[PDB]
Design a protein around this ligand. Structure first.
Ligand SMILES: [Zn+2]
Ligand SMILES: [Zn+2]
Ligand SMILES: [Zn+2]
Length: 591
């Protein structure tokens, strides 16, 4: 409308800040505290607060006065007139009963910060529930406004169908050819486009909202997008029940899911349940396990990556009656997703969808997978689209968070990823998946005591092929992300003096160190990010340079736990080293 409730207190108001990126309602007290304490001096009501005299055009509430019934410049004001902005209040409708809040100072920060220091993202998650939304809107609003800052790309030459030659206009910084970046082609809108560099090279791979055939000399612009208005909270209000509501158990489970009826039932005695699942503990199993235990129920599976949502579709394909399954692909289809399920049949008993592609519907169970990789925006969008009797958050605050491409200075603790990991970390999880089915007992006991407080167990026994060395080596920055050849050279001698390890997989905290490892040892390489989901049978973690990013325990965990039988780790930090229950080697004895 244009009369609403203060986004800080709940008071009624007709005023909103006209230079904050999202124009939020502010009451007469909070608007005062906002404008005196911040560069924001433009106040909007039904009519903007500007000077009425012709051609004046000053819009600084600290300079506008009320004369008669029109607003006035200091130079233009009539004889008697009072300021719009004095006494601690801004001139609005409900001037009597605007209470205000001490939390106005948290607003002023959220409304003014550039989203670069990690201190701001922690506030965005510890604040009041209404400000949790404002932070989330403005965060996504500035992120889409930064798109127009990155440079544009022209097509120099076509190296093949379908691979291209990036050419990036200098004079403005150049965005990463990444999934987090969606370009549109061109004076005709050719479609949506996503990019990926082919084997660490100067050319780029290519998937799109197909199928236009590109002409050399085209353009790719990171198009800024529109940002929703958040109304549903990040987490719906919690309800405890005396009996399984809305859902109807079955008798009985097949032999496979019997171990999870205990937990499947819990998911029915509360409005929302939170499930932690370290790698290999089979969370996709648990998630489809619900729809088997409550076969009458409509369940909607959702997550962030099309990869995660496809991971659920697959586990569902072999356990569920594909007749009433549907994959919800948006109108703009850029990634090739699942194919065996029907498409866009918004009525089927089983729905699979990206959060962004969620349709407005309802469910008896809503399953949100990879919850750590969410943003509080993502949550509020889930609760707005899906009215649901139950919600089962499934994720792991020890694995990866969502990439926050604006954050440069700072470290975000896992307790402040979502409103949901904040719960999992302080209160603990409701369900915990404690049996690891993927890893040798050596590496699971190291994580189980590093990040899981020894709640995590092992099924595989020890493997022996778990090794450990404190080789510092020197680091060199040809590329900004670091490089350390002196310890890769150790790997070469290791692998050359070793047998099956040739089929190992290289995992380093740094995007460059992998690339050179492609030169010096030519193994299959995967970033710790590009390894969640996949599991490998021999891995080598070559950390580097003692940066924070390198000592990041969470990312450490996802890398290590890719292993099925064997692992070694050349370590650049003496402290983390002795936490690995792996057999140590030395430079003089790496036999
Ligand atoms: Zn403002
Ligand atoms: Zn207020
Ligand atoms: Zn004026």
């Amino acid at each position: 409308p244009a009369v609403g409730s203060c986004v800080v207190c709940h008071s009624q108001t007709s005023l909103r800040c006209g230079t904050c990126i999202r124009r939020p309602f502010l009451c007469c007290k909070c608007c005062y505290d906002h404008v005196i304490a911040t560069p924001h001096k433009m106040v909007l009501s039904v009519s903007p607060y500007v000077c009425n005299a012709p051609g004046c055009g000053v819009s600084d509430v600290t300079k506008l006065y009320l004369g008669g019934m029109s607003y006035f410049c200091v130079d233009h004001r009539p004889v008697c007139s009072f300021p719009l902005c004095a006494n601690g209040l801004v001139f609005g409708l409900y001037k009597n009963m605007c209470t205000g809040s001490p939390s106005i100072v948290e607003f002023n920060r959220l409304a003014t910060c550039d989203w670069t220091e990690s201190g701001d993202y922690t506030l965005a998650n510890t604040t009041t529930e209404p400000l949790k939304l404002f932070a989330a809107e403005t965060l996504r609003a500035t992120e889409e406004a930064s798109k127009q800052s990155y440079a544009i790309a022209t097509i120099k030459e076509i190296v093949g169908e379908r691979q291209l030659l990036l050419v990036w206009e200098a004079g403005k910084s150049k965005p990463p050819l990444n999934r987090n970046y969606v370009f549109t082609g061109y004076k005709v809108q050719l479609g949506e486009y996503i990019f990926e560099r082919i084997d660490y090279s100067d050319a780029v791979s290519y998937k799109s909202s197909t199928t236009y055939k590109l002409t050399v000399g085209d353009i790719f612009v990171l198009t800024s997008h529109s940002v929703a208005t958040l109304t549903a909270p990040t987490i719906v209000n919690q309800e405890r029940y005396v009996k399984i509501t809305g859902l109807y158990p079955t008798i009985t489970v097949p032999e496979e899911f019997a171990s999870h009826v205990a937990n499947f039932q819990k998911s029915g005695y509360s409005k929302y349940v939170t499930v932690q699942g370290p790698p290999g503990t089979g969370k996709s199993h648990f998630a489809i396990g619900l729809a088997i235990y409550y076969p009458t129920a409509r369940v909607v599976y959702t997550a962030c990556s099309h990869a995660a949502v496809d991971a659920l579709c697959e586990k569902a394909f072999k356990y569920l009656n594909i007749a009433k399954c549907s994959r919800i692909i948006p109108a703009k289809a850029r990634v090739e997703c699942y194919d065996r399920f029907k498409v866009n049949e918004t009525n089927s008993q089983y729905l699979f969808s990206t959060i962004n592609a969620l349709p407005e519907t309802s469910a008896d169970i809503l399953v949100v997978d990879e919850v750590s990789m969410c943003t509080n925006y993502d949550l509020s969008i889930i609760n707005a689209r899906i009215k649901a009797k139950h919600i089962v958050y499934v994720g792991d605050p020890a694995q990866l968070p969502a990439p926050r491409t604006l954050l440069t200075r700072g470290t975000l603790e896992p307790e402040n990823f979502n409103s949901v990991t904040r719960l999992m970390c302080n209160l603990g999880p409701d369900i915990f998946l404690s049996m690891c089915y993927r890893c040798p007992k050596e590496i699971v006991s190291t994580v189980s005591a590093l990040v899981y407080n020894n709640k995590l167990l092992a099924k595989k026994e020890l493997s022996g092929q778990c090794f450990k060395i404190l080789y510092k080596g020197n680091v060199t920055h040809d590329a900004s992300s670091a490089i350390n050849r002196p310890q890769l050279t150790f790997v070469k001698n290791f692998i050359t003096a070793n047998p099956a390890w040739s089929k190992a997989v290289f995992i380093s905290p740094y995007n460059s160190q992998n690339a050179v490892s492609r030169s010096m040892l030519g193994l299959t390489t995967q970033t710790v990010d590009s390894s969640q989901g996949s599991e490998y049978q021999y891995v080598i973690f070559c950390q580097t340079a003692d940066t924070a990013h390198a000592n990041n325990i969470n990312r450490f965990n996802v890398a290590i736990t890719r292993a099925q039988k064997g692992i070694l780790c050349v370590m650049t930090s003496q402290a983390l080293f002795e936490s690995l229950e792996f057999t140590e080697l030395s430079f003089t004895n790496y036999k």
